[PDB]
Design a binder for this molecule. Structure first.
Ligand SMILES: Nc1ncnc2c1ncn2[C@@H]1O[C@H](COP(=O)(O)OP(=O)(O)O)[C@@H](O)[C@H]1O
Ligand SMILES: Nc1ncnc2c1ncn2[C@@H]1O[C@H](COP(=O)(O)OP(=O)(O)O)[C@@H](O)[C@H]1O
Ligand SMILES: Nc1ncnc2c1ncn2[C@@H]1O[C@H](COP(=O)(O)OP(=O)(O)O)[C@@H](O)[C@H]1O
Lengths: 326, 326, 326, 319, 326, 326
């Protein structure tokens, strides 16, 4: 009757389907929320600037806040625009003037325009936005999302309360993953759990995206699949490949590299990045880590210029055999 | 010579003549074929993301699926567009805009678009295709081909079923080469065969294009003609050249090189890639292989850095900055 | 009946709320102001050129000169373009053809175009400007802003009344700090005051913007809050990181970088910028200072060109460990 | 009209005095007409500077209205095989002249293109019908022609034309073909041709192929070279300390004109000395331009890189 | 009915018209002449290896030898071939087979095959020659010509009598020239002769070719014409360009270079060779000559790789300005 | 016919005229020659493995072995192949089996196949040789040549009698040179002999060539002719030149190079070869010797690629003084 289990899990993004709906559902940002609640509890708040990584809270809170601030009106008093991609037409001109001119729904004191990826706007775009901002201050309240506050011109920055979102701890990312798992028919094995936490590195959205894609292959989330979904390899394999080289077993490490490459089908950059991570979890004297670190930097730049992936990766492993002889 | 033979033996691409038209006519991608058959046998499939090398199954598996799904109605329900060659993102979100606006043919529930070289798209481009993908999510199903899944933005990957195509085994490649050989009337010499395998190293397409090419020169497939069209020197020659130089006969290694570059007029990268390969077929101590591998990586970069004019030009402008303030 | 404390402070930029609105309200640069009062009480004034540090008197003085020569419409006879934020000497020349186009509002002898950072234009550009300055000379007067009168060409300078502003002392702007800090109800801690001073680097505007942003974070203007909003790290922390590297403590330097990166949430460019500034306050010989300073620029080039941030940033630390040894 | 015939082959000098800028050469050429005696001639230099103009202009004065036969014009870059160069000549310099002088002229355009052996064959052919015909070999560098042919030739080195010379000629074509030669466009055509008269005539035309009005824009547009002002700005930005914006402008240029690393590179080379900076800076830039031209060159010399690598094997070879 | 002198001067190359006919006429190769005379005087002669520069006596000697060995029969019994495959190694070993499979004319005991540029053959080729050499050793006698004996394989070298030709002293060259000047009614000025000798550096052929070229321009041989037809600028001029660049006048040096290039019409390599010849004749400190010699070597190699000449030449001049700042 | 002394000397290469005929003719391997004679005495031998450097006795002895075992029939029973020559050894494998097929001529018990450079065979290649070593062990006997026995697989080593040839010594080489001098009517002087020994440095083949070449100029072998025919300058001269450069006397070095070049007419490479050798005989610290040597190698590469000989020689001498004063 219905579609296949595969399409059922791929249709709607788990990232959205399970985004917390209230400032009390959000996690790991405890201090950030306390500040936000104060707003909703007193119907008073200035323009906001949410700085930090993607998938750690920002837009979840930008929505939750509006929700607890307008109840059933959030959707009629909250304009979500994405500066960068610019979803649609001139999503920064005639669109706003409309929303901005009308009034809030309910006894609401103001509206909210959530400009996501604001730091993607040129200095000029930000100048215009500065005016377009102070223009309807009385009616609209801005919530600017960005990677780095230092990428937003000061005129705009001085009119905002700065919030700095940081990565989330594993436990928190884990609780959410365990929940989505149970409430989806998944058999989240612990190996698969750890495999997701490690890669995700504190980015909730990222962990979810890996969890979902994983489930599409099978309801039993195994680490082997966590790795097949992300262009990732087993952290254990990457280390062996390096140690083998360091120890002096260049040919063998070339062998290992060949396997990881064939099994995972990941890119040179993918391997390089994993290499840069595992190198620091190696029983190697400090001085060798210094040399290793420099080499990874240099080879990363060679890849950027277009150098041959396999040739460069093998030349890097040989460098390891060289740094290993000391 | 061959009067008209060199007109019929090469008028139609043997890759688009002997290309499997049935999922079960595909070799090497077993577990992938299994999954694909399950789609045609349910009428439901989500968006597809095909990751791996070229000429190894990705496009024949797209067509062999359109066939088993649209019967003779494939040429009108299955569209193929190259993400790179195509003018741009817009032209892309355009051609599909008119294709996915009219229902299928033959009662098929949906039509299919095949975006080849999808990772060739910029991030912004992948943002456009993303929206367009969701826009026509009911009428059309997308099959995105890419060299690495890690070069496709997460929003799109979290909506596709991931498939990883690996290189075909030499066995299967030969099985099909003999076939095409018989039905085409060719003296498939044991030599010329091994050549094509050694050069193709897993790439079905590449192996065929070469086979057909050598045939276009002479009905009898000689490893001589293989290397000729293959634009690759004889491994024996490459190894000799490198071995001579290693012995200490630079002057002689250099003549050998000149000859090669003279005969088949290969390229710097051609020779380099062949040298990278043969380093591991030489009778030398591992430590020497370590060095040679490092050196070949280095000259690969020298070649790359040389042909990357923008990187050079910008490094120049930066030199100006350190100068214009001295 | 009142907004929360956070909203009161932010509502208007303190840099304006404490801006000498009149010529006779400026303190510190007396000799200069008096000369400016000669043009207000005479009606006649030539093209001008202000020389001095940022936020030391340049803008506040020019703005005041538009209130005593236009009345309350200091906005309909006073343009404001930034030579460095503008394309070139065309988009700028065009803006002067649309401003001087229509005679000054009311009975106004002429309008005024405050070109900020004029000495940021190339000399071929400073020519076109000199050409444009005169052509409209009649209806519009200019107030070219620069950092050094010497960075302005001859054709220009000879036509301007050179006003030079002296860098306000460090404990000088401190006055206009403890003031506003007490006039706005703030427990401006001594540390924090010093922290603002270190980052302000002689610019009052930046110093005010930092207090306002810091005050919005809490009543007590602390150092932890001056950095968090400034998007910078404690100079001691930067230097300690660089020093820790030079000494060969690579591993420790890494963690310092991680901490800074994690907590303060800085950007690679942010870090690289602070590294380049704290490298000269190092208990190190000048020769190493220049080398290190160039390495920072080398790795930034890599970043500008697409290299991986954490990989390169750490590679840079290793260069430090390596350069320390030599 | 419109574009019936290339201004070049149309407004080409017919007399040795119609030629300008190669005075030392013309004076020597008019000594041949004056005595009716002349040896094999060797013309070396760039294209569009006077070589063929003189070849024709000379043959006209040595044969008069009757010179269309006493002048077999050939082009060395012919069908791979000089076996066609001995039969076509076997009968040309076998048929003595009449009406003209005591000999015939065979203008072999681009003679420095022949291979060693081909040139040695031309040395016997040259000597074969020496009494009948007289050769006029045209080349880029006389150093490409074998000495046995250089010693038998009177050598003339055609230099690039000066601006004043080229300019006026363009004018005497504009004011007779319905054209407006403004100042922005003139200084433009000149700047790009760098003394090449054929080029400055193909640029004047192509730029007028949009309208008689020759604008500095129509000029750079038709041609490849980018706006000197742009290249110059980019460098000043860079020099001024604004690497980011310069990088930006560069992309522009490339994105616009669609040029190569070397074209842009030569253009930079040219404007460096045309910059408001002190001399010492020009020293450092000059050095830096050379360095990067070398990097680009080295990067593309696949033989040198490969042999450098084999030389390295030799090193690694010694255990 | 005569011809203009310019015409009578260019009818036949003087290197030929005046090439010595007898061994006794040959100059500056005393000892060699004697060895060869002993062959004609005894009818006994082995294979020969003539090593040395071009235009100093090798060919003349080979010919003069034939003339004395075969009288008028020298053209019949003496065959010259350019090893530099004036058609291809074999299609040259073929021409020697036809020529060798026949009896000598006039009743002489053997014929001569004079190989020009033997040292231009690869080792494989030189190995084939050694065979052909041994094959007809009884009928033919080979005279192999090379720049350096060390470039000919030992097997061949052992079967030959080595003759090491040297450059000719100026006196020797002067005589010949003044002789030809006498016989051609030219005015060889002291200066013109000094120029010719300077430029020829001992190569008789070269000297005579310059004389001839210059005579074609005027019975009066002036150094102005010598330099002009020899495509070399005068020493004093090259020295000026260097001293100009060396004292700080880079812009001037460039100009001078421009003049030389345009005036005399040299090449990039021509200027470098001249600079190398003249740099040691400058009133400069030894440490500077050391840095300049190193630079000329570096730039020579850049030209060898095909770098742009003007760009490299100006860049080299800039190096003179830098080195110039003691 | 009665040719002059010279023609008689160059009649045939002395290396071949005096090639050791019998095992007692061989010089310098006394112990080995003893084992070899034992085989001829008993008419039987196992497979052999010759190890050591080139031109020191391996082939010579192998041939001398075949001559004594087979007498006049050696050429029929002794086959010599080169392992490294893959293509040829395969396009001749048929001939080999043929040699191994037919019985030994003259009634001898077996034929010998001499595999030169047997250590250029891979592990599998060596495994296969072993197969055919046993296969025909009854009719043919193998003599494998290599640089190191350690490069031949244990299996194959187990089946052979190992012989380790060592370098020859001046004394062995000098005795043979004396024998030839006597058997040719030469006046071998001490200076001449020591000169030869010095130039040949352990190479018997080269030593004989130098002697023959010198005998062709005179019957009295002087150290003057030896250096000349060998195209080498006085070793003291090369050393003095380099020492002069190193002390900082670049100009004197240059003068010396001039004198040398004036006295002989060597090539850039001739000089570099000698420099490369004499640098190791300078009273210099070893690390310097390695620098200088590397440097000569670098400049030889420019020369081989077409650089200007004299310009590079001078640039090289400069590099010496730059290195010295450091
Ligand atoms: N504290 C959190 N609690 C629960 N889910 C979270 C939290 N932070 C992020 N997420 C998840 O990550 C996704 C990314 O949105 P968000 O956190 O606002 O970051 P961004 O600014 O990159 O959009 C959300 O859809 C949500 O599922
Ligand atoms: N020693 C010499 N005596 C007389 N003429 C010489 C001598 N050396 C060179 N020449 C002249 O230089 C020309 C070059 O020929 P030659 O000396 O044989 O050198 P190559 O073998 O390089 O051609 C000859 O035509 C001859 O006129
Ligand atoms: N003892 C010797 N007596 C005479 N000549 C020798 C002797 N040893 C080597 N040679 C010379 O060296 C050449 C090289 O052969 P050989 O010594 O067998 O070494 P390889 O194994 O490298 O071939 C011989 O042809 C011969 O000219």
């Amino acid at each position: 009757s219905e579609e296949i289990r595969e399409v059922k899990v791929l249709e709607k993004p788990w990232v959205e389907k399970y985004r917390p709906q209230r400032l009390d559902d959000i996690v790991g940002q405890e201090h950030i929320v306390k500040r936000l609640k104060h707003y909703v509890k007193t119907g008073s708040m200035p323009h906001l600037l949410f700085a930090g990584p993607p998938g750690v809270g920002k837009t979840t809170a930008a929505l939750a806040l509006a929700r607890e601030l307008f109840g059933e009106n959030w959707r009629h008093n909250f304009l979500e625009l994405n500066a960068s991609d610019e979803r649609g037409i001139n999503v920064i001109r005639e669109k706003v003037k409309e929303f901005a001119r009308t009034k809030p729904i309910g006894g609401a004191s103001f509206k909210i325009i959530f400009l996501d990826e604001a730091d993607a706007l040129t200095q000029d775009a930000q100048q215009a936005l500065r005016r377009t901002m102070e223009m309807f201050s009385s009616n609209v309240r801005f919530i600017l999302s960005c990677n780095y506050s230092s990428k937003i011109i000061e005129p705009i920055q001085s009119r905002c309360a700065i919030f700095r979102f940081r990565p989330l701890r594993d436990e928190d990312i884990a609780k959410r993953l365990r929940y989505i798992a149970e409430n989806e028919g998944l058999e989240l094995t612990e190996e698969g759990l750890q495999a997701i936490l490690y890669i995700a590195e504190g980015d909730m959205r990222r962990a979810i995206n890996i969890l979902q894609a994983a489930a599409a292959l099978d309801k039993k989330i195994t680490d082997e699949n966590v790795f097949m979904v992300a262009s990732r390899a087993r952290p254990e394999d990457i280390r062996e490949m390096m140690l083998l080289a360091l120890k002096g077993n260049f040919l063998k490490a070339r062998e290992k590299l060949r396997e990881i490459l064939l099994k995972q089908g990941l890119s040179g950059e993918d391997v390089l990045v994993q290499m840069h991570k595992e190198v620091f979890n190696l029983p190697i004297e400090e001085p060798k880590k210094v040399l290793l670190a420099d080499k990874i930097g240099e080879y990363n730049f060679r890849l950027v210029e277009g150098a041959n992936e396999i040739i460069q990766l093998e030349a890097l492993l040989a460098q390891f055999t060289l740094i290993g002889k000391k």
